[PDB]
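Researcher: I'm comparing several assemblies side by side, and this is the next one on my list. It has 1083 residues spread over two chains. Same procedure as the others: predict the full complex and return the structure.
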Amino acid sequence: VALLSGKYPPDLVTNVWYADAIYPMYADTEVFSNLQRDMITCEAVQTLV
Amino acid sequence: KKTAQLLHADTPRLVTWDAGLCTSFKIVPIVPAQVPQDVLAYTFFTSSYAIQSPFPEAAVSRIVVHTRWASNVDFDRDSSVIMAPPTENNIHLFKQLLNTETLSVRGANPLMFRANVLHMLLEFVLDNLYLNRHTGFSQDHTPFTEGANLRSLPGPDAEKWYSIMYPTRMGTPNVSKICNFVASCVRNRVGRFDRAQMMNGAMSEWVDVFETSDALTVSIRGRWMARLARMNINPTEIEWALTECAQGYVTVTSPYAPSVNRLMPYRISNAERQISQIIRIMNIGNNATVIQPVLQDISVLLQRISPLQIDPTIISNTMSTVSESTTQTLSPASSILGKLRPSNSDFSSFRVALAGWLYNGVVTTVIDDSSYPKDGGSVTSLENLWDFFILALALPLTTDPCAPVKAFMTLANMMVGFETIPMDNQIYTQSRRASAFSTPHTWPRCFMNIQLISPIDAPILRQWAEIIHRYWPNPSQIRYGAPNVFGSANLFTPPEVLLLPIDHQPANVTTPTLDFTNELTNWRARVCELMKNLVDNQRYQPGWTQSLVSSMRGTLDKLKLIKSMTPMYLQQLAPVELAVIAPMLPFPPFQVPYVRLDRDRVPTMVGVTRQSRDTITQPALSLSTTNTTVGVPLALDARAITVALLSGKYPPDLVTNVWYADAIYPMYADTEVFSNLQRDMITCEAVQTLVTLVAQISETQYPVDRYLDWIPSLRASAATAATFAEWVNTSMKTAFDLSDMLLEPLLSGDPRMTQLAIQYQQYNGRTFNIIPEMPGSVIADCVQLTAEVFNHEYNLFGIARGDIIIGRVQSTHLWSPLAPPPDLVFDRDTPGVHIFGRDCRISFGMNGAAPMIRDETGLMVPFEGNWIFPLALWQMNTRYFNQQFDAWIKTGELRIRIEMGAYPYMLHYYDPRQYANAWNLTSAWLEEITPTSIPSVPFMVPISSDHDISSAPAVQYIISTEYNDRSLFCTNSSSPQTIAGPDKHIPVERYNILTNPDAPPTQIQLPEVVDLYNVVTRYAYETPPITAVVMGVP
């Protein structure tokens, strides 16, 4: 059903839509904390061994 | 909704009359005149003596668009385009389509502009579809003209219409601008100057007059009149067409004398009927509940018209002719009178079998499965015998192309356990139910050639196959209609021809007596003889007395010799009735050829197409793939058809000519076909208009010219195209006052590759195509002419062309911002400009170093110079750009050119003798720019003075790149001259018919310049109903 039906707004501009979609999603990002967490995880594994 | 649309459709309103003025532009006074001044004495001006003036008396006057502001009409199209003066905001016109996501009330999305203008132009055309009406005249009793004839307008307050409509009648006591202009004109070109007076003491047929109007709507109404004139017909042709339609059973008369001119627009072209038929066929497909009421209506009408009536007792009495003894348990006559089972209320099922003959291309009539034996047929039982007899009589009347094989297999299922013949496989065997054999593929190979049947093993089936193969009824054709007015809608068959599965022969005598030479009796004779063969069998008899074999052959001879008038009626009277009825049908006949036993030719598919695929622009290549199949079967009762075939009766005294003359007379007084023709024309016009308008915003396969590609428009998709098409459909339906469906079958799809064609294919693989020709359309051509004119006259419609420069300019000079000096403008080719695009990045300054922004070349520049921006860059970074650049634009030396293409504008006027600053308006405009919308551009323009004034400072911040002041009329229209500010005199080119004495009176200057004084034709034609002039003999 999802394949046979589906549509776009009759006033879509992809640049505007994707700017408005990406700004608030990236404004809440956690990659830096994840990188620090991965560093500590690797340290801990080596210490245990 | 669909079946009501099929039965009858709303009649559009074509002919409408206008009694006002043929103009749609209006001059208005933006600024008040300075009459009580202190250089000229007030006695100079003609405003103080209260002379009515042809033009407004003001310091500034401007032209605006206002459709039908002077008209007086008897029907309302209700699609007006109304424009406020440029000192008001007109954004609401440009924000009506696809601006549903705009928050501000004062802004519109630029990328939608081209969509909004096009629709606007359509509206402009739709409101001007009218005919100019001839009112009446009077001769001048004053010396102001040379005894001219002046026209009268209906309604109140005509004393101002007289001053507006004849500019050259005004006196000239003065050296004002208006007096100079009107003294420069010629004086003999006012009023009427033609007259077609054909009959004494009646209205003149038409007149030609000089009057205030514009050339554009005159052109539109000329095209409209030309179309309606090509559609016209006269009473004699109507008489001939009606006489042909009735085959001679109705006579109507026409008058013979010189009469007044009438307008009865009804003749259309054949392609229009083709296209309408195709649209309707795709509208009806695969739905039985849509088409069944049509056949019911036609059957009721067939009963109303026909002399034959059904008398069941004609069988019953013959059945009582022989007696059977009270010493037996089974009786043939009882079986007949039980299985036939008449009640005379089933006559409909008979008539429905005849109406189906007109529609075998979309409907198939098949025998209901319950008529067959419940568990299969056994030759030993009498019920099964007579069921076979009923089916073998009933099958030929249907249009099901597989009836012969169904009959053959109905007998073969009876012989299982008695005789055997080879089959093709194990699934479709001899014990298979006969109804299962429903396609040409299921036809067995023994049926084709008779060598596969043993004459010693199955002689009965050998004989039955021979009987079927050489004695099945032959198809025929008859002539019908009157194509000189109605045309024809025959797609695959030639026009004027109606096909039948049964041979037709006309009658020689109007007082018929029983005859058995008809084909239907000959078939029944074959059937009864073949029944006798297998009844006489000694293998059948053992459970039966010899007297029972005799009584079976006796009752087979009773029905062989029944007095049945049904067969002769179908051979001679029924085809005439069908040919008479057919031209009045609201859904005209649609057929595919009948084939008798030629299996290589049975039709297996009927398909209409509505769009194309990818990279295929020619219909012949894409029709074979993009089509959609159409058709449903219909179920009939076998016992009803058999009873009607056996028991037909004429009235005791019948003379056919008198009967049909009395019956057919009332039905020809109805005029629904003349409405259907106008409906067809409107449908074709709408389809072509849709194609032409859609082609402008997206790519398509048709060749069309493109005038408005300087207006910004979005990247359209399928959704945008559908959304535009729905607006087009709504406007088209509202203008012509239609409440039912129009263009909606097309809109359930992608409208960017539309096409119309139909095809059908045979069993052996041969396919036949119909591709109707596009007839052309006048609405589309008028819309394209409106586009051509708009290309030069965009200023009157509120749109300015080009770009703008933002920058501080301060001086005491009095030039207009809509026509600035060339030294204030710069462009891409100017030495020293910087051009910006997507990747501009601002870097902040430190310790007193200036901030910078990145060029396209890669160099980084500070905030002063000549920059070129596209609008979207400011749109997508609005707040940041404002907060960075506004101080430097306001006080610094920064000037920015914003590329916009087309935009609306607003005008603000001021007194030049005082200080004026425009920063507030421009700051508001800059700050109100958002990613998806902008407001109207504000301009500041000085007021013109007719005497000395002192100067004062002024600050300007927005200028336009090119000349955009075309909507200005004269300034200081009452003073002798203009001393300061922009100066303009009354435009001579608009009044060229009056100012140039050597020009012909009928000249026009489109599309470059729209004239404002023209020659107009006004008519007085009659539009009576057809019944009024064509009278039948009661």
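Model: For your comparison table: The radius of gyration of chain B is 41 Å.
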